Amino acid sequence: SDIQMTQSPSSLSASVGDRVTITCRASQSVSSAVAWYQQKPGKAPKLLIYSASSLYSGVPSRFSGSRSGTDFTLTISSLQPEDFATYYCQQYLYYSLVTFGQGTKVEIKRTVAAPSVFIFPPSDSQLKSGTASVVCLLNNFYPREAKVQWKVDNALQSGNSQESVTEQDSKDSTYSLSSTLTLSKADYEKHKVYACEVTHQGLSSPVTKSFNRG
Amino acid sequence: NEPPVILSMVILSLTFLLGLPGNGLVLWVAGLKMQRTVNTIWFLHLTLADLLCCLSLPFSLAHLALQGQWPYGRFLCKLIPSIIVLNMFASVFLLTAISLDRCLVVFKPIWCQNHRNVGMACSICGCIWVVAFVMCIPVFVYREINRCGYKLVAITITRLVVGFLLPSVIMIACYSFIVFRARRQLADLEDNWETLNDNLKVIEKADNAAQVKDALTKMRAAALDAQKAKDFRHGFDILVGQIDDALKLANEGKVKEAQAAAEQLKTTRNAYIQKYLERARSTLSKTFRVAVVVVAVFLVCWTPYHIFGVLSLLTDPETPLGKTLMSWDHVCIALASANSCFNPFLYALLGKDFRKKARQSI
Amino acid sequence: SEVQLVESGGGLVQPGGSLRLSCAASGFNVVDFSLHWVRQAPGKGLEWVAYISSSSGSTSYADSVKGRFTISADTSKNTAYLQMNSLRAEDTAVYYCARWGYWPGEPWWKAFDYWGQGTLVTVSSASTKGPSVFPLAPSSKSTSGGTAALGCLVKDYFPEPVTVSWNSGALTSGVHTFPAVLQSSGLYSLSSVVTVPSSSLGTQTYICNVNHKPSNTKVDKKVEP
Ligand SMILES: Cc1cc(C(c2ccc(Cl)cc2)c2ccc(Cl)cc2)sc1C(=O)N[C@@H](CCCN=C(N)N)C(=O)O
Secondary structure, three states, rough: OOEEEEEOEEEEEEEOOOEEEEEEOOOOOOOOOOOEEEEOOOOOEEEEEEEOOEEOOOOOOEEEEEEEEOOEEEOOOOOOOOOOOOOEEEEOOOOHHOOOOOOOOEOOOOOOOOOOOOEEOOOHHHHHHHHEEEEEEEEEEEOOOEEEEEEEOOEEEEEOEEEEEEOOOOOOOOOOEEEEEEHHHHHHHHOOEEEEOOOOOOOOOOOEEEEOOO | OOOHHHHHHHHHHHHHHHHHHHHHHHHHHHHHHHHHOHHHHHHHHHHHHHHHHHOOOHEEEEEHHHOOOOOOOOOHHHHHHHHHHHHHHHHHHHHHHHHHHHHHHHHHHHHHHHHHHHHHHHHHHHHHHHHHHHHHHHHHHHHEEEEEOOOOOOHHHHHHHHHHHHOOOOOOOHHHHHHHHHHHHHHHHHHHHHHHHHHHHHHHHOOHHHHHHHHHHHHHHHHHHHHOHHHHHHHHHHHHHHHHHHHHHHHHHHHHHHHHHHOOOOHHHHHHHHHHHHHHHHHHEEEEEEHHHHHHHHHHHHHHHHHHHHHHHHOOOOOOHHHHHHHHHHHHHHHHHHHHHHHHHHHHHHHHHHHHHHHHHO | OOOOEEEOOEEOOOOEEEEEEOOOOOOOOOHHEEEEEEEEEEOOOEEEEEEEOOOOOOOEEEEOOOOOOEEEEEEOOOOEEEEEEOOOOHOOEEEEEEEEEOOHHHHHHHOOOOOOOOOEEOOOOOOOOOOEEEEOOOOOOOOOOOOOOEEEEEEEEEEOOOOEEEEEEEEEEOOOOOOOEEEOOOOOOEEEEOOOHHHOOOOOOOEEEEOOOOOOOEEEEEOOE
């Protein structure tokens, strides 16, 4: 059977200068045949530590690796504005035994902020085309952990809608979210009131944005 | 005439005769022939301390032969016992520092590789000599003459605390940690060998490729683990290469060829792995015996001295027990000084290269 | 130059069919370093694909790609080739080529010291249709002060890249561009919004000029309250 590998720190938040610890566990004895790779969004990965004991050339000395039995630990002493990327672990015990981890993402922490939630209904071109699409915009939220739902005429709706979120804002290091649900013309004209609820953690109560059709 | 006095004289004479030429030759070989390293500095300091301690043994014999009567002035009576105590404390601290260094070079190898040099050894030897002189100062201060001696409790207390308890505890802890780490390494090597053998036991009669390749991957992992525990590295590289060849042959659906390639490993196994396992076992046995002998000699040499020093304050000298303690104090100090002769036979005369240099010197 | 790996098999294919990915090396010889392939789905982790040995002839494939893919190498031009057949939606990812060394030496213990540029292999299962643009403005009232919002939504476009700019770049402070999302039918949707005080809404209009590079679709959509 294939040697499984589990990576518990899927995503963790930290600040500039703080230390980061990433733990990894193997299925059986691997004999330090685990290396680490750093990949930026939209670029090819690059190695930083091999065999969990030696540092590769050109890599800053801030990264360190340790091995304890079948466990591996990657330690970053101080973060920099140039190393915020995804971290992967790969087992290289043999050519036909390559196995990658789940990946570890790092983000920058920010202060408390309230997301200005807005909602946009379909326009006239949506009704002319035969299909309508109503969207919702969440502007500024730091933890990226929030739940947004749609109140379709005093009824909750989920599954059909689709949401997206931007990451690593260059201006304020915050995050923005865009939800969108599409329906037919007869399925949209039959209702009169719509609403969108947001249960962001940084808010004292779920904020609702509603609009009446016509 | 008294049996304890004759016993002390005989012990001191034997210690002198067995220590002076040996320590002199060891110091000469370490100074004129051996290269200037850290262990060389430690051996030189130990031999110098032993020689300075043995050079005063004729004075101790002359003092004991006169039945305590010291016709010389107070200068020698205050000087020579202080010098004896100085040499004893210097030797004890040097042995403790040698044990601490031998523990640190195994505990944290990177820190020693990047910091341990000759300058640090010279500095710690100077600090040892300074501490020994500080401990010797009260001996020279409080001694006064006719019977040379005293006329005290806190001095013996701080002596037992600084010179006997802490150094012995440090040495015992260091030797125990070294023995435990070496035994753990040997256990890991034996577990790797067992994982190599038990899976081959079923590979030799297997009937499926999945179990064969799994056992071969386990063998490769065990070999990579044991490689970090010279012809040894070449043999492990050959073993790993043959294991990779067996894996490549097994992945192509050739079960019989893979079994043949796995059975071919027995040659290099019996050629390198068994030999190096026996060598590691012999090395562990040797170092364990050396540590046990050194600890036993140190204890036997330095325990009765402090025991009698403590009992001297808890027993009146006018009582027969006090007289017995005062009479056997000579035997106790002789047994303590015998450690000065037992030092080179347990620290310097055990190195193979040092033994070869000493043999070629004659 | 240093060690470099270039791919030339990027593009889109149909469900099944066949495709040929190429890997060209520069700065070293392929006769002495083994070449492997690693997949990476968009928004997922890495996954090993296959391994080819130039000086050994032995090949290896992942458990989920056996009997469908083939790998080979050519020491004349030092180029690796990967022939993929019977492709499905799971194989849509960015393939990366790497090189791991030989056991008699240090390069074996070293990790993937040099990665390739990455070749995107996706399954179309559809055809180009052309994006449709729709404005997005508040319905009746916002009362948010000097923090309003207006956007444009492009929908039903198959290719990934798309360009959008407000007033040809005159308005940039507050323009938020969100990544595209894959629908169940096979099309994509993107929303580009911007925030501006309400005082500017009653003075100057806004146009979200959107151009599609893989096609000839340019739309100038006006947004007004
Ligand atoms: C180490 C040492 C060695 C000594 C010399 C010596 C004595 C006298 C003169 Cl003039 C020259 C040399 C000697 C050694 C052996 C023999 Cl056979 C005869 C003499 S004296 C001495 C020492 O430090 N005594 C202390 C502590 C003793 C207490 N009992 C304990 N701690 N167990 C003390 O007096 O309180």
